[PDB]
Design a protein around this ligand. Sequence first.
Ligand code: SAM
Ligand code: ZN
Ligand code: ZN
Ligand code: ZN
Ligand code: ZN
Length: 466
Amino acid sequence: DSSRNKVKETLRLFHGVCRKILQEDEAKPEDQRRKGKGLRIDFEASTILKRNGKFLNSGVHILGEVPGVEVGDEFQYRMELNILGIHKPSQAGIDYMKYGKAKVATSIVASNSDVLTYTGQEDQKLITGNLALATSIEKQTPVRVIRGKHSKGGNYVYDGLYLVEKYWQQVGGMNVFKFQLRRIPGQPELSWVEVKKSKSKYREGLCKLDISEGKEQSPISAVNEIDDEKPPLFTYTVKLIYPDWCRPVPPKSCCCTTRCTEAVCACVEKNGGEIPYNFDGAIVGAKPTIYECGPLCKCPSSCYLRVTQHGIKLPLEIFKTKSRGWGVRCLKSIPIGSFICEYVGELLEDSEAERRIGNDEYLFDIGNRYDNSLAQGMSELMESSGFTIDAASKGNVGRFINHSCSPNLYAQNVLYDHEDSRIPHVMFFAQDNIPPLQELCYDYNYALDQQKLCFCGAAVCRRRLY
Ligand SMILES: C[S@@+](CC[C@H](N)C(=O)[O-])C[C@H]1O[C@@H](n2cnc3c(N)ncnc32)[C@H](O)[C@@H]1O
Ligand SMILES: [Zn+2]
Ligand SMILES: [Zn+2]
Ligand SMILES: [Zn+2]
Ligand SMILES: [Zn+2]
């Protein structure tokens, strides 16, 4: 609830600190850098959050559901599990707590879909963690299972609550304990099961293979498992449509022959003397404006300042919701800070967009969307436009992204093929590690009374869309 938002914002803060530390290391000459030394940005970020009182459920073990943590949630670092109190050991696979005179397991990190076999702990002994997991069988107390998928992206997934049914002992060439767990009925489906079904021959609800019809480099399918509706009529466009008096003037370019770096390069200077992306392509954090290198920059395509201009990289699809029409999701998980897509449509003066008929549901009002909340919290740890994008008649997949009061995306202004700040590119970025098939949403930011109810379903919902 408030708990859900607290959890998400705590993880967001953590990754913000990680990527700021990394940004500061990447700003150094490639021998003053510590990443080789075995810099540990997750460890350092964890220490910073700890000293500033940001850990949740600290000093206590929890049996069963953890408030604000949901089945399917993903984590990049094991340390995130400790920050949230999901799983306390930094390395050990089994976490446990006192229970009556005994100890029972609270959580395991694990490397017929409701059934799981888990390997324990040079013979293994029935002590500590192994003994606790064994005791879970007798008490029939719940165990949280965190599944390791195997580096940016979700590496761990919360798969929910399980019961331990039995254990046995076998040669691993020394002796090991093995445990069989079974998922408690009534929980949301495992995300790996949902993904498996989405990859099927006969996948239910498939309406259209490609709503772009060949224009996108990768097809964007449409799925409807709710009703018989097919996707709405519109002309798919991967290119912005400019008025003629707004066609791009050649921007200032940089003379760098190698990839651009900083804390010489004009484009680094545009960004305030720093690189707004990490070297792995993820955005460090939202800013009012990001300047990418342009067509005449001497730098290679691999330039750290060339990200959103390369277009969609993720496998997107549109799908039917029960109460908000069509929305957008991704067939795989999305690492925090990843570029999603642009909001593409016709660029119009606000007055022109307003005058036109039938387009009100597909307008992106440019400007005043930078949220500096995170920048502020992080500092504690250590402009307007007269233009609108009309995607009603002509637009890309961006027109289908719904609103949420607790969104997993945000809009980011980007300039690269021109310097006209009145009409920046509107680029969406992830602000969570997003589970596969989770609906993608951002804050529409409509002012109330300039009525329509908000159906985003968040616990902190502001109740009205406008
Ligand atoms: C840009 S369209 C998004 C795609 C749209 N759902 C469709 O089927 O084409 C914006 C419209 O989606 C609906 N919508 C988006 N988010 C909503 C929300 N949180 N609550 C209620 N309706 C929403 C509203 O009808 C809104 O006018
Ligand atoms: Zn440069
Ligand atoms: Zn440049
Ligand atoms: Zn460059
Ligand atoms: Zn809402």
